Amino acid sequence: TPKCRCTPGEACWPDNSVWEAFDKTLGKGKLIKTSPIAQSCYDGPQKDLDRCAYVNKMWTDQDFQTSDPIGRNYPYNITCAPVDYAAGETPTSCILGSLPYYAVNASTREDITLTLNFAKQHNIRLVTSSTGHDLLGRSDGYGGLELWLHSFRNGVRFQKKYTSANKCTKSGWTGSAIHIDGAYQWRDVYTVAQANNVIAVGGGSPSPGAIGGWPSGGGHGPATHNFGLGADQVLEAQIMLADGRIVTANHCENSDLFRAIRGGGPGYGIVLSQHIKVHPNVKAVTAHRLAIAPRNETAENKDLLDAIAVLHQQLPALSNNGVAGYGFWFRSFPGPFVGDAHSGYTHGFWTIGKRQAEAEKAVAPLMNALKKFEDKLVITSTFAEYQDYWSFYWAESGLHDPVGSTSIITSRLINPEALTDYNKVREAIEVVAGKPEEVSSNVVLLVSGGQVFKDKADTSSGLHPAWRVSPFVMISGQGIPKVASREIRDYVQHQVTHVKGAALKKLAPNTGGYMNEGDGSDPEYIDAFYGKNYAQHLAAKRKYDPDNIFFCRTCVGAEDFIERPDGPLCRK
Ligand SMILES: Cc1cc2nc3c(=O)[nH]c(=O)nc-3n(C[C@H](O)[C@H](O)[C@H](O)COP(=O)(O)OP(=O)(O)OC[C@H]3O[C@@H](n4cnc5c(N)ncnc54)[C@H](O)[C@@H]3O)c2cc1C
Ligand SMILES: *[C@@H]1O[C@H](CO)[C@@H](O[C@@H]2O[C@H](CO)[C@@H](O)[C@H](O)[C@H]2NC(C)=O)[C@H](O)[C@H]1NC(C)=O
Ligand SMILES: *[C@@H]1O[C@H](CO)[C@@H](O)[C@H](O)[C@H]1NC(C)=O
């Protein structure tokens, strides 16, 4: 049976009549022949400068990118760039690249069954997308048939008391739940949680999918320190296997599959629905806004980075005190970042469940450590109190930031013991700060600790062990030009993987990274992404998808195949 999937233009590729008959079986209009988002910017039959300008204007918008079957928030390889003609830009070339060639706009189980079956029947690579949010190309594939789940939406329903499809009691959970009965986004789930005065533990941005890559890789957000990571919210799922069977996965049934999807990434089956734990609303949340800038701005920014190193050392104490959230910093920035300075550190942290007085005590270990820098840095610190989770969430989080660039980042979970020696930390900070000429994004995800640590007791979970000891994640990355030569991308990828990523590993060598926002070019990605759970993830992969119908890049088992950006996917 053939080692390589069939691709367009080959003799094995179904001819126009076969595709047309497949469109008609589905329901005319469901099969979409994909077109590069910005093809109207280029010469040929599809050229349209009005369409091109609209596309150029809307490229950075998350909804615009989720609305097209091959729209990508963080496109893995821009092979058809939008062209800004008003700005004097001119076209190079436009190809599909590694984006799927056909998509099925699937809105019923029958759509999904037929798409799965057709892919297998014609040996065509099946690509699964709920939203196209992925940063690593795991919802892409050259010459692929995309199962697009964006309109597969059969309700989001609140359960006052979790009620399992197979009456499983082994979760031990008798609290409330939400049945996410479709490939909904967090926005949709949040509306129902809010209507029912409960906390749904979703992402900091509401556009990503609720039941796909987000929970399967981990899933962080404002509420995860307090209530657990996204993967650990999952009580059960309905999943269509490669063989077409629809099965329940929970503590009582196919528990190896259930564990795999809760931390082992995508590619075990097509997730049709999940049930998630939801949590009682709180009476208070206080947010802490901190900003730090140099009094004396220089290319080295020695004092700023000293303080950032110190701040990193304070995070575990903060985490132990119920503090969570996100911090952002730059050694150099192309313009004012903190007040008047073209550099600095800023964060939005919070104590869910605590009023301001307790919030101030919670961050005291950090503010006290920062008193030593009052002569050297300008530091501002404010608190905002909210009377429930949702007013807090929408005020301090619920982000819809600009997107549309390639992601080249590395992530490293940091254990407390990696931070006790200031000099080692300072050295890590020096390297990840990057070259003063090159913009380096550095981000702190203070999203673990607390309940995430506690949920180590849950052996049904598949989450990377390092989550259970690491209260926060460091992410460091750089951009590439929109139209990027191979040489420039290899230079940047090397800085991210072997300079930035390497420093982070040296700082914390016993932990790992975060697959969803992580380094897909790391030679050691298996270790980073999955850790010691990998052998068990792989077993589930080989049991439930022996033919690797759900192949994705870096996903468990992907090393048994060779992916190309411009040719057939093949088994080794
Ligand atoms: C603007 C933006 C903001 C973000 N914010 C956050 C954040 O705050 N916190 C955080 O942790 N992450 C965040 N992410 C990252 C997100 O967790 C990952 O990109 C994740 O892969 C998104 O899953 P998705 O289904 O939405 O993406 P997709 O690209 O649709 O799919 C991602 C992967 O999951 C697979 N997949 C999707 N749906 C299914 C399914 N139903 N069954 C089987 N496999 C499936 C795909 O095959 C692919 O491998 C953000 C991403 C974007 C674009
Ligand atoms: C982005 O897409 C381009 C175009 O498909 C890829 O370039 C090809 O890469 C292979 C090696 O992997 C070469 O043998 C081809 O000659 C390249 N083609 C062209 C037209 O340049 C590129 O590899 C993709 N980048 C990534 C990181 O996936
Ligand atoms: C996808 O299908 C739904 C109906 O199931 C329809 O409302 C929607 O507009 C379709 N989208 C596209 C892009 O064809």
PDB file of C-alpha atoms and ligand atoms in Angstrom, residues 62 73-74 128-135 138-139 149 203-205 208-209 211-214 219-220 266 269-271 403 514 516-517 552, ligand 1:
ATOM      1  CA  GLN A  62      -8.109  37.483  13.382  1.00  0.00           C
ATOM      2  CA  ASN A  73      -3.593  33.849  11.963  1.00  0.00           C
ATOM      3  CA  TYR A  74       0.085  32.930  12.183  1.00  0.00           C
ATOM      4  CA  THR A 128      -7.885  19.069  10.120  1.00  0.00           C
ATOM      5  CA  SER A 129      -8.609  22.719  10.943  1.00  0.00           C
ATOM      6  CA  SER A 130     -11.035  24.158  13.497  1.00  0.00           C
ATOM      7  CA  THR A 131      -9.758  27.755  13.124  1.00  0.00           C
ATOM      8  CA  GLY A 132      -6.310  27.977  11.437  1.00  0.00           C
ATOM      9  CA  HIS A 133      -4.810  29.534  14.571  1.00  0.00           C
ATOM     10  CA  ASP A 134      -1.864  27.144  14.678  1.00  0.00           C
ATOM     11  CA  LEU A 135       1.662  28.579  14.903  1.00  0.00           C
ATOM     12  CA  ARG A 138      -0.166  21.494  12.252  1.00  0.00           C
ATOM     13  CA  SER A 139      -3.373  22.474  10.423  1.00  0.00           C
ATOM     14  CA  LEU A 149     -14.695  22.231  11.197  1.00  0.00           C
ATOM     15  CA  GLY A 203      -7.410  31.243  26.507  1.00  0.00           C
ATOM     16  CA  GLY A 204      -6.458  34.854  26.961  1.00  0.00           C
ATOM     17  CA  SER A 205      -7.681  35.374  23.402  1.00  0.00           C
ATOM     18  CA  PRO A 208      -8.871  30.127  19.120  1.00  0.00           C
ATOM     19  CA  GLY A 209     -10.778  26.827  19.062  1.00  0.00           C
ATOM     20  CA  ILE A 211     -11.640  21.668  21.518  1.00  0.00           C
ATOM     21  CA  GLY A 212      -8.685  21.267  19.081  1.00  0.00           C
ATOM     22  CA  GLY A 213      -5.061  22.244  19.519  1.00  0.00           C
ATOM     23  CA  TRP A 214      -5.684  24.534  22.489  1.00  0.00           C
ATOM     24  CA  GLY A 219      -3.970  25.554  26.983  1.00  0.00           C
ATOM     25  CA  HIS A 220      -3.119  28.519  29.229  1.00  0.00           C
ATOM     26  CA  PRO A 266      -3.386  16.527  18.004  1.00  0.00           C
ATOM     27  CA  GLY A 269      -8.870  11.193  16.135  1.00  0.00           C
ATOM     28  CA  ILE A 270     -11.256  13.966  15.069  1.00  0.00           C
ATOM     29  CA  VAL A 271     -12.589  15.653  18.210  1.00  0.00           C
ATOM     30  CA  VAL A 403      -1.791  38.725  13.802  1.00  0.00           C
ATOM     31  CA  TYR A 514       4.980  24.230  25.320  1.00  0.00           C
ATOM     32  CA  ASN A 516       1.215  25.137  21.122  1.00  0.00           C
ATOM     33  CA  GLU A 517       3.573  28.102  21.431  1.00  0.00           C
ATOM     34  CA  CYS A 552       0.595  16.591  11.613  1.00  0.00           C
TER      35      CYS A 552
HETATM   36  C1  LIG B   1      -4.726  35.174  18.205  1.00  0.00           C
HETATM   37  C2  LIG B   1      -4.319  33.875  18.855  1.00  0.00           C
HETATM   38  C3  LIG B   1      -4.316  33.896  20.239  1.00  0.00           C
HETATM   39  C4  LIG B   1      -3.943  32.780  20.987  1.00  0.00           C
HETATM   40  N1  LIG B   1      -3.975  32.846  22.341  1.00  0.00           N
HETATM   41  C5  LIG B   1      -3.636  31.770  23.080  1.00  0.00           C
HETATM   42  C6  LIG B   1      -3.669  31.805  24.557  1.00  0.00           C
HETATM   43  O1  LIG B   1      -4.026  32.858  25.126  1.00  0.00           O
HETATM   44  N2  LIG B   1      -3.311  30.704  25.241  1.00  0.00           N
HETATM   45  C7  LIG B   1      -2.906  29.573  24.630  1.00  0.00           C
HETATM   46  O2  LIG B   1      -2.577  28.582  25.331  1.00  0.00           O
HETATM   47  N3  LIG B   1      -2.866  29.458  23.283  1.00  0.00           N
HETATM   48  C8  LIG B   1      -3.201  30.502  22.476  1.00  0.00           C
HETATM   49  N4  LIG B   1      -3.162  30.403  21.078  1.00  0.00           N
HETATM   50  C9  LIG B   1      -2.651  29.141  20.493  1.00  0.00           C
HETATM   51  C10 LIG B   1      -3.570  27.979  20.310  1.00  0.00           C
HETATM   52  O3  LIG B   1      -3.653  27.306  21.564  1.00  0.00           O
HETATM   53  C11 LIG B   1      -2.968  27.013  19.284  1.00  0.00           C
HETATM   54  O4  LIG B   1      -2.597  27.693  18.071  1.00  0.00           O
HETATM   55  C12 LIG B   1      -3.914  25.864  18.965  1.00  0.00           C
HETATM   56  O5  LIG B   1      -3.299  24.988  18.015  1.00  0.00           O
HETATM   57  C13 LIG B   1      -5.246  26.374  18.437  1.00  0.00           C
HETATM   58  O6  LIG B   1      -6.115  25.290  18.158  1.00  0.00           O
HETATM   59  P1  LIG B   1      -7.162  25.589  17.008  1.00  0.00           P
HETATM   60  O7  LIG B   1      -7.979  24.349  16.857  1.00  0.00           O
HETATM   61  O8  LIG B   1      -7.837  26.908  17.263  1.00  0.00           O
HETATM   62  O9  LIG B   1      -6.150  25.774  15.759  1.00  0.00           O
HETATM   63  P2  LIG B   1      -6.144  24.930  14.373  1.00  0.00           P
HETATM   64  O10 LIG B   1      -5.044  25.540  13.508  1.00  0.00           O
HETATM   65  O11 LIG B   1      -7.515  24.887  13.776  1.00  0.00           O
HETATM   66  O12 LIG B   1      -5.671  23.476  14.768  1.00  0.00           O
HETATM   67  C14 LIG B   1      -4.530  23.317  15.566  1.00  0.00           C
HETATM   68  C15 LIG B   1      -4.121  21.855  15.553  1.00  0.00           C
HETATM   69  O13 LIG B   1      -5.174  21.129  16.165  1.00  0.00           O
HETATM   70  C16 LIG B   1      -5.750  20.201  15.258  1.00  0.00           C
HETATM   71  N5  LIG B   1      -7.202  20.218  15.464  1.00  0.00           N
HETATM   72  C17 LIG B   1      -7.993  21.299  15.510  1.00  0.00           C
HETATM   73  N6  LIG B   1      -9.270  20.950  15.757  1.00  0.00           N
HETATM   74  C18 LIG B   1      -9.286  19.626  15.880  1.00  0.00           C
HETATM   75  C19 LIG B   1     -10.335  18.645  16.158  1.00  0.00           C
HETATM   76  N7  LIG B   1     -11.591  19.112  16.340  1.00  0.00           N
HETATM   77  N8  LIG B   1      -9.975  17.335  16.200  1.00  0.00           N
HETATM   78  C20 LIG B   1      -8.688  16.946  16.003  1.00  0.00           C
HETATM   79  N9  LIG B   1      -7.666  17.807  15.764  1.00  0.00           N
HETATM   80  C21 LIG B   1      -7.922  19.140  15.699  1.00  0.00           C
HETATM   81  C22 LIG B   1      -5.267  20.592  13.887  1.00  0.00           C
HETATM   82  O14 LIG B   1      -5.208  19.401  13.092  1.00  0.00           O
HETATM   83  C23 LIG B   1      -3.933  21.225  14.197  1.00  0.00           C
HETATM   84  O15 LIG B   1      -2.986  20.161  14.349  1.00  0.00           O
HETATM   85  C24 LIG B   1      -3.529  31.527  20.288  1.00  0.00           C
HETATM   86  C25 LIG B   1      -3.535  31.518  18.882  1.00  0.00           C
HETATM   87  C26 LIG B   1      -3.931  32.626  18.140  1.00  0.00           C
HETATM   88  C27 LIG B   1      -3.952  32.501  16.623  1.00  0.00           C
END
